[PDB]
């Protein structure tokens, strides 16, 4: 058979024909070769389950052997799966920087990554500098931002500011960035974004051994437990250095702290495959974490 597949990066759409024996690795390799990406360790191919979950393709398995939702064409999103600890030291290629910028900016503008208003205005000004270059008055006259989506809806809704007021606040900062190259505006954006509480955190709905609703966060530095209505402030923090072991079986997951005296933290996921995906992200993040320290 010849199966039709689309892979979308943040700024490219690729249509492929594959065969039943094509592996995720072979699809991934063709994607990164087409776009010129060398820093591949951060990225993966996301898809929708037969039951509607967003998960990552296994590159060491056949594409059809995984339970990708049966549609034509098959739809994959080439996205960052792991985040660096410091964008300045770790994102060396310009394409890598731009793919992280677009993906992060998308999550900020769609309210998936919480951002307070003052930070949102400042981030928008660096995105403006990245798109328009230097603020020039022969080129940029009043209303030049009216067609740009610049701020998260949550920021708009709070605040009684009109569009022109938001655009003037952003314009003030845009003027401040005069002379900044477009790749430096992109990296400046990411330096601010990487300090946000929700940046680079994979959230999973989980439950206490009592049944209370919580969130688990998996990120580059370890695991966090959050209250149900506060994904900004971790209730309990488990950096890798403070974890003795982690285990899962079926739906149950257990974190043992480096200190026997300290109690185990026990939580439940809704499905076995969620626990597998949590652990896949723990192992990948733990692995990159150790690699940075060689």
């Amino acid at each position: 058979k010849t199966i039709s597949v689309r892979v979308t990066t943040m700024d490219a759409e690729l249509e492929f024909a594959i065969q039943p024996n094509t592996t995720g690795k072979q699809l991934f390799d063709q994607v990164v070769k087409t776009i010129g990406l060398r820093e591949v360790w951060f990225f993966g191919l996301q898809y929708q389950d037969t039951k509607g979950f967003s998960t990552w393709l296994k590159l060491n398995k056949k594409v059809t052997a995984q339970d990708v939702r049966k549609e034509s064409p098959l739809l994959f999103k080439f996205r960052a799966k792991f985040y660096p600890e410091d964008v300045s030291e770790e994102l060396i290629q310009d394409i890598t920087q731009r793919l992280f910028f677009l993906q992060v900016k998308e999550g900020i503008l769609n309210d998936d990554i919480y951002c307070p208003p003052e930070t949102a205005v400042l981030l928008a000004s660096y995105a403006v500098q990245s798109k328009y270059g230097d603020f020039n008055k022969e080129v940029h006259k009043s209303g030049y931002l009216a067609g740009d989506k610049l701020l998260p809806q949550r920021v708009l809704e709070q605040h009684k500011l009109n569009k022109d007021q938001w655009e003037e606040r952003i314009q003030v900062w845009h003027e401040e960035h005069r002379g900044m190259l477009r790749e430096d505006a992109v990296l400046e954006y990411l330096k601010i974004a990487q300090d946000l509480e929700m940046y680079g955190v994979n959230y999973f709905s989980i439950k206490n051994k009592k049944g209370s609703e919580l969130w688990l966060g998996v990120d580059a530095l370890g695991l966090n437990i959050y209250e149900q209505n506060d994904r900004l402030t971790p209730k309990i923090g488990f950096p890798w250095s403070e974890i003795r072991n982690i285990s899962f079986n079926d739906k149950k997951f257990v974190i043992k702290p480096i200190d026997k005296k300290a109690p185990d933290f026990v939580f439940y996921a809704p499905r076995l495959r969620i626990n597998k995906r949590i652990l896949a992200l723990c192992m990948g993040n733990h692995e990159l974490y150790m690699r940075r320290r060689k």
């Binding site: 759409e13 249509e15 492929f16 024909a17 594959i18 094509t22 063709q30």
Partner: peptide, 14 residues
């Protein structure tokens, strides 16, 4: 052998 074959491309500049 069974490498994927590129059939179409769209590039978004901005």
């Amino acid at each position: 052998d069974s490498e994927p074959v590129l059939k179409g491309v769209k590039l978004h500049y901005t």
